[PDB]
Swiss-Prot record:
Covered range of the whole protein: 21 to 510 of 592
Ligand binding (FAD): S233, Q268, H334, D366, A367, D368
Family as reported in the entry's similarity comment: Belongs to the DNA photolyase class-1 family.
PTM annotation, UniProt: Phosphorylation on Ser-228 by MAPK is important for the inhibition of CLOCK-BMAL1-mediated transcriptional activity. Phosphorylation by CSKNE requires interaction with PER1 or PER2. Ubiquitinated by the SCF(FBXL3) and SCF(FBXL21) complexes, regulating the balance between degradation and stabilization. The SCF(FBXL3) complex is mainly nuclear and mediates ubiquitination and subsequent degradation of CRY2. In contrast, cytoplasmic SCF(FBXL21) complex-mediated ubiquitination leads to stabilize CRY2 and counteract the activity of the SCF(FBXL3) complex. The SCF(FBXL3) and SCF(FBXL21) complexes probably mediate ubiquitination at different Lys residues.
Alphabetical UniProt keywords: Biological rhythms, Chromophore, Cytoplasm, FAD, Flavoprotein, Isopeptide bond, Nucleotide-binding, Nucleus, Phosphoprotein, Photoreceptor protein, Receptor, Repressor, Sensory transduction, Transcription, Transcription regulation, Ubl conjugation
Stated name of the protein: Cryptochrome-2
Co-factor(s): FAD; (6R)-5,10-methylene-5,6,7,8-tetrahydrofolate
Modified residues (Phosphoserine): S65, S228, S259
Modulation of this protein's activity: KL001 (N-[3-(9H-carbazol-9-yl)-2-hydroxypropyl]-N-(2-furanylmethyl)-methanesulfonamide) binds to CRY1 and stabilizes it by inhibiting FBXL3- and ubiquitin-dependent degradation of CRY1 resulting in lengthening of the circadian periods. KL001-mediated CRY1 stabilization can inhibit glucagon-induced gluconeogenesis in primary hepatocytes.
Knockout consequences: Animals show longer circadian periods. Double knockouts of CRY1 and CRY2 show slightly decrease body weight and lose the cycling rhythmicity of feeding behavior, energy expenditure and glucocorticorids expression. Glucose homeostasis is severely disrupted and animals exhibit elevated blood glucose in response to acute feeding after an overnight fast as well as severely impaired glucose clearance in a glucose tolerance test. When challenged with high-fat diet, animals rapidly gain weight and surpass that of wild-type mice, despite displaying hypophagia.
Subcellular location(s) per record: Cytoplasm; Nucleus
Amino acid sequence: ASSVHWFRKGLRLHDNPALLAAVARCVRCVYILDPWFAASSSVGINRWRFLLQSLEDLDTSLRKSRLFVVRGQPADVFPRLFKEWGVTRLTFEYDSEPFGKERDAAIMKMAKEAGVEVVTENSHTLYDLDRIIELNGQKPPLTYKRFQALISRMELPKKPAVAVSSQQMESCRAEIQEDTYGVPSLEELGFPTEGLGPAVWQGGETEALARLDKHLERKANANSLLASPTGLSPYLRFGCLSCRLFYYRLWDLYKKVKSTPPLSLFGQLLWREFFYTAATNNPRFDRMEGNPICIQIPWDRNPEALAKWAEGKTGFPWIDAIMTQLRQEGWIHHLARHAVACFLTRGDLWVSWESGVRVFDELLLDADFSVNAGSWMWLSCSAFFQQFFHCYCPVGFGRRTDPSGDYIRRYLPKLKGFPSRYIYEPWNAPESVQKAAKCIIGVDYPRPIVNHAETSRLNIERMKQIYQQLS
C-alpha cells in the first residue's frame, strides 16, 4: 500500500489521524497549488504568504522525507500521480464545506474507478458535524444557544491524536534530489514584494505550537486591538493548530486554577464549530438569494460606497483605522469586525453582507467559507434569529474602546496631531486645531460619507419593516 496524504486544510503533523491513516509501505505528502490560479487570485498577499509559510515549515518538519507541492488542478493531476507513483491509498482530512465535499466526492469516485481506496478523517472541527446534525433532528441548530445546550448533553470531543513518530518516518520515506516539487515564493505566484517587511502573523505549525504555549501562560483595552503574539485564529483556520489540542489544553489549565467549565471558555471554538455545522449542508451559505436561512433584505448595490469602505476612506477614523489595519496585516479584533460590518450593512451603508464577505475573504487570515459567511449573516441580522443589537456608533464605539486615540494614530498617521477629544470625529474640530494637527478635513483626509444619526434612524426603519412581514 503506497499512500498519498493530501494537505488542503489541516497543515500540521500533530493531531492528524488521516496522516496516521496513510502510515504501510510508501507515503508521500502533497499539496496541490495552481500557480496561475494563484497568479489571478484576488486574494491578497497576506493570505498567500501565510499559506506558503505554513507550507515551508511543514517542508522543514518533514526533512527530519519532504513535501511534494504538485502544480495543477486536483482533477487531471491525481490520475498522473496515481499511475506514476503507483498509488493504492489516498488519505486527507475531511472537509465539511459544500464545495469541498462535492470536490472531494469527485476525487473519491475518480479514485474509485482507478482502483484507489480513499480514507478521510475529521480533525478540522472538534466534533463530527454530522453527528451534531442528526442529534438535532437532522437539521442544523440555527441559534448558538440551541447549539450549546446540545454540546453539553453530548460526549466530550475526541482528544488530540498521537502525532506520527520518527520511527515510521524512516521506514517508508523516499526522495529525488533534483526541488521541482519545491514550495513556491510570492514572486513565482505573481506578487510584488517591493520592500515587504516581515509578516505579523508568520504561517506554520511551529509558530502555532509556539504561540499556543505563550497563550496558555498562566498569570494572563487598546492593547487588545493590536496583533497579539499569543493570538491563534489564523492557525486554526488553516489547521496549523488543531482545535482539539487547543480544547483540552484549555481544560488542563482550567482544571489547574480550581471542576467542569461553562461552554464560554471555549468561546472562540464553539462559535467556529457552530458556523461550520450550520454550513456543511448549505451550498448557498455565502449568499443571500437561494439560501434557506438567510432573510431576504433589499441591500443597495453600491460599488462606490463599498470601495470607500474597503479602502478605509470613510470619514470615520475608527472605521478607516480598522480597514487600514485589516489590509496591512490580515487580522483585526473581533469587536472591530463588528464595527466595520455593522457600518457596511445595517448601521450605515446598507450594502450587502455578501460584499463584506468578499473583502474579508481577500484580506482576513482566519476567514473561510463557513466562519466568515456565518459572522456576516449574524452581524447583519440576516440569519440566526437575532435581536438586532443595536448600534456601533462609528464615532462612539471607537472613543469607548480606546479613548487615547492611539489605535487611530498608529494606523491613520495623517491624523497624528489631533487631540483625543477630536481624533474620532476630526470634522468637529475648528480650523485652528486641524491646522495645528497639520490635517485639513476635506483635503488631507475625507469628510464622513454619511450622516450617521440620520442614516441609522433610516436603516432602523428598513429592518423593522423586514421583520414585521416575517413575525
